[PDB]
Write a protein that binds this ligand. Structure first.
Ligand SMILES: Nc1ncnc2c1ncn2[C@@H]1O[C@H](COP(=O)(O)OP(=O)(O)OP(=O)(O)O)[C@@H](O)[C@H]1O
Ligand SMILES: Nc1ncnc2c1ncn2[C@@H]1O[C@H](COP(=O)(O)OP(=O)(O)OP(=O)(O)O)[C@@H](O)[C@H]1O
Ligand SMILES: Nc1ncnc2c1ncn2[C@@H]1O[C@H](COP(=O)(O)OP(=O)(O)O)[C@@H](O)[C@H]1O
Ligand SMILES: [Mg+2]
Ligand SMILES: [Mg+2]
Lengths: 467, 53, 477, 508
């Protein structure tokens, strides 16, 4: 079907279809454009007119240009050939390596799995990282919030999660970058190429990148999360595996939604956010679940405006999170890596009914001893180390050993640590911390636990450095 | 007397800092509420003026 | 085309279709769109009709045909719904077959007046020691559960629902309670896991679940509480007892705010419209307790509110506190510390249910409340005694999850605690004593607990035998 | 409902068949004019953001194309435009001249010379609204952009192709940071190394003409105009010109970036471009958002700042650094435009007034300043000394509260306070006196190795002075070695040790 552009206010374009109207959310292509321009319908103003949000610059459009109704929403190429390929919101590759050749196309506007396509039992995603797997296990098919986001290891941690999940469970991964700085986007592309999660030669990649740039109109940065979700939903459903979906950043998702809502001419709500904030977030976050075929585990990088946790954006996103990780500058200083704050990290499934009584007790003991050491550090700073008892110097030693053991060497950071990366299973982690808490290793030096895999590596390090 | 006085001053300052921290937490919560309320109020004024033309 | 019983969608967009026609459509009437959705005709305007779509506006198009059903917005009600999950319009979503119900009730029907009602005289047992002894909830009451993110409110609701099985498995038709759980703006994963948890506790055979999860359009989240309340009003008006749990009533407020703003209505305080108080009072005024001239049925309500950073003097929390008959303030500090249920007994009150509490629990919990109140004011000799006893009681009121207690076991445990038998036990071992003590009385001495339950009081002989039991057990612990 | 073209004049024309003698495709008749916005009837073949030209010699940009009419924003006073005027298409989106013919010339937002030095050379033109590069042309930031300021070059390094942000309050030193950066590039432009020359563009949005005239005099005094363009959009200019001036500057810099050279553009001030756009949007009846700003204001600034790139050698290798300046109010970096541009850019040089009046001018507040590029934009010698300087300053900032007490504390905190005070007195700098990198590294090396722990702080600002002159006169071979080599070789380290000790061994 063919219509005409009747109006062009900013990034909003009003089109007129004399024949038949396209339903809401469809994509229309403007004919007579040097570069593909896609308009997503959003309203039916009556008199056969529709109002569309543009996915690219509308400058140079003329009242009357022909617009072709595609007939289905934005359809992107999904498959195994998207792995290692960057592509913008409308699916066109932007890494200049040729077309994304696939036999499949998926519409980015889908619906959450019905109530019966839902796993009824909780699970645990084993990422092979001690701190994450012990103090804040990642639920399978559950959103994880990730805080910090500045020179603390967010990218290295993301790459390590990608590698472990593609090595342990064999699932692939999607990286949807919402409102992504082009400089940092290119830097991330190259870091992935170096670490090996993308392979431009042999086609053994493990990540599909989807960049919604920071200079695209608000109507494009609002939908790239949906493009990433579609790329991941293919792997969930069709490939029947567990996928990871990194959304960086989620505050930019909400902010772009807010800008689109304002542009369409809607009254803002609480703090000048869209009146549809809760549903705009829910429609996306409800497609990151554990269907009976596979699952999608999402990792949202989260930014808290004004450092206010009650701002509508994080107040609404935190309603969906099923866990939390808190990279801290104060721990990268100590040389511990990954710099995950052991105490500020949180998880919903840290429950004896889900993770098991032994796992729960080990985690609670580690948290308690770390809190005890934190409290004792004030006494050390003030009254001096002498003031401690003997049932407190012991706890200080045990807590320092635990802090050292929570650090790990990543396979994607062998050019930063000189060691060889370890993917510690879960049983190894639980046993190591159980033994350290019991006191079985009180005779070893603290540095024998720094940056080692399982506990047996700590034993070997002690032997190698003492002898 | 000087030993006990210095110890008591240390304890008193610790308690005063703790009370100031609790008060700072409460006032930060109030400040966030008030900041959001002010944003919403100004925005509603703008919206009402725009729609009342 | 019949422009009286049928119209054509002039303009869709925002989730508020404008239709042209339907000249004979009543206000608040339900219409059906061609695609398959349904809507409610809000604004009967001179030239069009504003229909709010109970679904996704993507499916509607300008030109579609709207046909009036001829009846005001109503939902199917009856016994046929027990054990089923249903969306906000009464259509099953658990895929176990058609709902198949004979009676339909309006969701906008008005609450009973001043004469039908009667004071709350029966107890609604929740099997949570802190709730049952310190803030009792009667039948017909409206007891707000107000808290924060992850502080254990859905846990209170589900423990209540699971506890009702002692009564719903017996024969006394005057004690059976039929539960309803309305989930609003809530992850569907959570609803599915909750339904599995109920099915594992054999607690679905008397439970309806109404779902309006976060992926459901705003009108469905705005309408789910009323569908649930009608499903409960059926039992209330048919002489049976119902218990509806809206969870949360703040997500419904957000949905209604979206609906109002998209209709270009004057935002008020926090951008909430002016009808929010009416929105919630209209709903919570239906949890009545009819008098025997009207059946004698009841409909308890346990609305759930999620404060923000512990702010209880916000706008919506204050509205619902001005609507409800009490509070159960769950404190996040306590919850994180280790106390669970983290009920802040200082700020949590139950105005109405105090007179519905059971005598056996009444006498023991009275002294428990006095002792805890005294302890609250001192946190030498008497001071040390009060601190010790208060800590014993506080560690006594900690509870597990999905393990509700019958009233008799609560009586036994609280009696042991308040009469000073644990005043020597180290404060940490109390729970270890508690979970052990119950087993003892739950095994050998069933006659005592059964007699307490039947007589509905701690008689002097029951008191003496309980004294003997507790002292002898404490001798060998 | 109603339309703005339903006025009885248009209907009268159309009723008696008089609408066929008027060419409503390339010409239009002004329906309304007010507050700088004209609403024109016709121009059916006019493109969004195209420039139309009114009968009275004025220009305008057609922004709002509605079914009934076209909303044009006038480039000047709407005194000359009257209802019924005739507006003709120009046919082309707005573009500006570019080239080396602009260097040393003050121009307005549209490339017209305003310094009265004659016509503008101009061989090539460039559209101000051109999409930035992509993920692929760029390559990581590596080369340094020598600011000539000890604090900025030591603790907040700025690479080439980076978007810093000089965020601060009113009268704190932002324009001074910009001008010192512009003036320090003379030592490279005069020289012959063709990959170190930096061409400078100074966009002056919303400043009064006296300020820009004084600034141009300041640059001319320092002989730093022969490689500088200044694009003025002063307060008296119409809102569209203030809105466009950043884009004209960015395109004049994109020319240099595309042609293999390196450019530095200082959008000063962006918070005024935001205000001009806000006015235009509110007068075009567009839906307001927070603080009355339109919805697409983040878009306005992002599509501008994302054109600061570091092209790769397959495209030329040129680059365009951006140094947007934003004036926060009280200290609210959580406001709307400060938030947008803090989330867009790659760092921030955060200036204070407390520090300004405590004597720490330039008032760069380290701790709140950041550079997400970091050491990648530093030379090896500067890395060597600045790592230790930054570590020591960080240690000093967490025990600065005790400064008043100081005494009656352990020896470790005494040493931390002493070293921190010496380092802060080192980072103090004059005005319009940038420093070559060798001078900066020499001074910081002297500072961070303890060779000033004996001098009293009040004397440090003198030491730093005199000492510097010494090395700049007696020891040129060592400075040249450090400069060209780029690092501090062990022999050069020993020479610096001997020089610092010999000069300090007799100072007084
Ligand atoms: N009585 C209890 N004992 C131990 N743990 C509990 C108890 N009640 C709740 N929890 C823990 O608290 C967590 C959250 O509980 P719950 O879902 O009831 O809170 P909520 O307020 O409903 O959460 P949300 O606000 O996210 O819906 C659960 O994972 C559970 O492990
Ligand atoms: N390092 C410095 N040493 C001495 N004086 C300085 C220094 N930096 C700035 N000043 C002085 O401070 C005054 C204000 O500086 P400047 O105008 O550059 O700040 P500004 O923020 O650009 O002001 P505005 O933003 O209001 O235009 C100037 O007169 C300048 O001479
Ligand atoms: N496991 C690790 N081993 C060594 N260094 C690490 C590790 N994790 C993070 N880092 C350090 O953290 C710094 C920041 O890394 P990265 O997270 O990629 O950047 P950003 O935090 O800006 O995304 C790197 O310079 C790296 O040296
Ligand atoms: Mg809950
Ligand atoms: Mg200035």
């Amino acid at each position: 079907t063919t219509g005409r552009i009747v109006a062009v206010i900013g990034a909003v374009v009003d089109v007129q279809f004399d024949e038949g109207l396209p339903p809401i959310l469809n994509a229309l292509e403007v004919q007579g454009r040097e570069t593909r321009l896609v308009l997503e319908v959003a309203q039916h103003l009556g008199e056969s007119t529709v109002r569309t949000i543009a996915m690219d610059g509308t400058e140079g459009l003329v009242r009357g240009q022909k617009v072709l109704d595609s007939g289905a929403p934005i359809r992107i190429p999904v498959g195994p050939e998207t792995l290692g390929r960057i592509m913008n919101v409308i699916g066109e590759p932007i890494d200049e390596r040729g077309p994304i050749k696939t036999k499949q196309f998926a519409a980015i506007h889908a619906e959450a799995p019905e109530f019966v396509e839902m796993s009824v039992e909780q699970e645990i995603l084993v990422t092979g990282i001690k701190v994450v797997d012990l103090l804040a296990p990642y639920a399978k098919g559950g959103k994880i919030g990730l805080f910090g986001g500045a020179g603390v290891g967010k990218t290295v941690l993301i790459m390590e999660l990608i590698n472990n999940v593609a090595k342990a469970h064999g699932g692939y991964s999607v990286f949807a970058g919402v409102g992504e700085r082009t400089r940092e986007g290119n830097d991330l592309y190259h870091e992935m190429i170096e670490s090996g999660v993308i392979n431009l030669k042999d086609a053994t990649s493990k990540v599909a990148l989807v960049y919604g740039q920071m200079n695209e109109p608000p109507g494009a940065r609002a939908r790239v999360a949906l493009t990433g979700l579609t790329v991941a939903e293919y792997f969930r459903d069709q490939e029947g595996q567990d996928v990871l979906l990194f959304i960086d950043n989620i505050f930019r998702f909400t902010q772009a939604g807010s800008e689109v809502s304002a542009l369409l001419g809607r009254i803002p709500s609480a703090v000048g956010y869209q009146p549809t904030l809760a549903t705009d977030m829910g429609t996306m976050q409800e497609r990151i679940t554990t269907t009976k075929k596979g699952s999608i585990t999402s990792v949202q990088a989260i930014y808290v405006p004004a450092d206010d946790l009650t701002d509508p954006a994080p107040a609404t996103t935190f309603a969906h999170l099923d866990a939390t990780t808190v990279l801290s500058r104060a721990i990268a200083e100590l040389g511990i890596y990954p710099a995950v704050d052991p105490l500020d990290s949180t998880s919903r499934i840290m429950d004896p009914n889900i993770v098991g009584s032994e796992h729960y007790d080990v985690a609670r003991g580690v948290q308690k001893i770390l809190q005890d050491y934190k409290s004792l550090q004030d006494i050390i700073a003030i009254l001096g180390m002498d003031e401690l008892s003997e049932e407190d110097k012991l706890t200080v030693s045990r807590a320092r050993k635990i802090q050292r053991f929570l650090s790990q060497p990543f396979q994607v950071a062998e050019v930063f640590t000189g060691h060889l990366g370890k993917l510690v299973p879960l049983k190894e982690t639980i046993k190591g911390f159980q033994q350290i808490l019991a006191g079985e290793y009180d005779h070893l030096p603290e540095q024998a636990f720094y940056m080692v895999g399982p506990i047996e590596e700590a034993v070997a390090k002690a032997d190698k450095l003492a002898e | 007397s000087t030993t006990s006085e210095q110890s008591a001053r240390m304890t008193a300052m610790d308690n005063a800092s703790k009370n100031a921290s609790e008060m700072i937490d409460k006032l930060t919560l109030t400040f966030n509420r008030t900041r959001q309320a002010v944003i919403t109020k100004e925005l509603i004024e703008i919206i009402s003026g725009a729609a009342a033309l | 085309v019949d422009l009286e019983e049928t119209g054509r969608v002039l303009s869709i967009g925002d989730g508020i279709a404008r239709v042209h026609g339907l000249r004979n459509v009543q206000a608040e009437e339900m219409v059906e769109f061609s695609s398959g959705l349904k809507g409610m005709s809000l604004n009967l305007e001179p030239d069009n009709v504003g229909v709010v779509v109970f679904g996704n506006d993507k499916l509607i198009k300008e030109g579609d045909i709207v046909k009036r059903t001829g009846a005001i917005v109503d939902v199917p009600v009856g016994e046929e719904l027990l054990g089923r999950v249903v969306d906000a319009l009464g259509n099953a979503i658990d895929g176990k077959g058609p709902i198949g119900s004979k009676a339909r009730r309006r969701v906008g029907l008005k609450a009973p007046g001043i004469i039908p009602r009667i004071s709350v005289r029966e107890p609604m047992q929740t099997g949570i020691k802190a709730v049952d002894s310190l803030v009792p909830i009667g039948r017909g009451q409206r007891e707000l559960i107000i808290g924060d993110r992850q502080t254990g409110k859905t846990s209170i609701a589900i423990d209540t629902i699971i506890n009702q099985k002692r009564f719903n498995d017996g024969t006394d038709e005057k004690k059976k309670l039929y539960c309803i759980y309305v989930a609003i703006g809530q992850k569907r994963s959570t609803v599915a896991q909750l339904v599995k948890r109920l099915t594992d506790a054999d607690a679905m055979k008397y439970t309806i679940v109404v779902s309006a999860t976060a992926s459901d359009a705003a009108p469905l989240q705005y309408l789910a509480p009323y569908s649930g309340c009608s499903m409960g009003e059926y039992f209330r008006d048919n002489g049976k007892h119902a218990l509806i749990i809206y969870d949360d009533l703040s997500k419904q407020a957000v949905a209604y705010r979206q609906m109002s703003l998209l209709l270009r209505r004057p935002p008020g305080r926090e951008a909430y419209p002016g009808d929010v108080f009416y929105l919630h009072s209209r709903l919570l005024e239906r949890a009545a307790k009819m008098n025997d001239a009207f059946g004698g049925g009841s409909l308890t309500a346990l609305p759930v509110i999620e404060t923000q950073a512990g702010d209880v003097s916000a706008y919506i929390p204050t509205n619902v506190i001005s609507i409800t008959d009490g509070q159960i303030f769950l404190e996040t500090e306590l919850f994180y510390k280790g106390i669970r249920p983290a009920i802040n007994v200082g700020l949590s009150v139950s105005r109405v249910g105090s007179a519905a509490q059971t005598r056996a629990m009444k006498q023991v919990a009275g002294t428990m409340k006095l002792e805890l109140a005294q302890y609250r004011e001192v946190a030498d000799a008497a001071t040390q005694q009060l601190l010790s006893r208060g800590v014993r009681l506080t560690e006594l009121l900690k509870q597990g999850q999905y393990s509700p207690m019958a009233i008799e076991e609560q009586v036994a445990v609280i009696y042991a605690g308040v009469r000073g038998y644990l005043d020597k036990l180290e404060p940490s071992k109390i729970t270890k004593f508690e979970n052990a003590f119950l087993s003892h009385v739950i095994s050998q001495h069933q006659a005592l607990l059964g007699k307490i339950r039947t007589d509905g009081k701690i008689s002097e002989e029951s008191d003496a035998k309980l004294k003997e039991i507790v002292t002898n057990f404490l001798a060998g612990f």
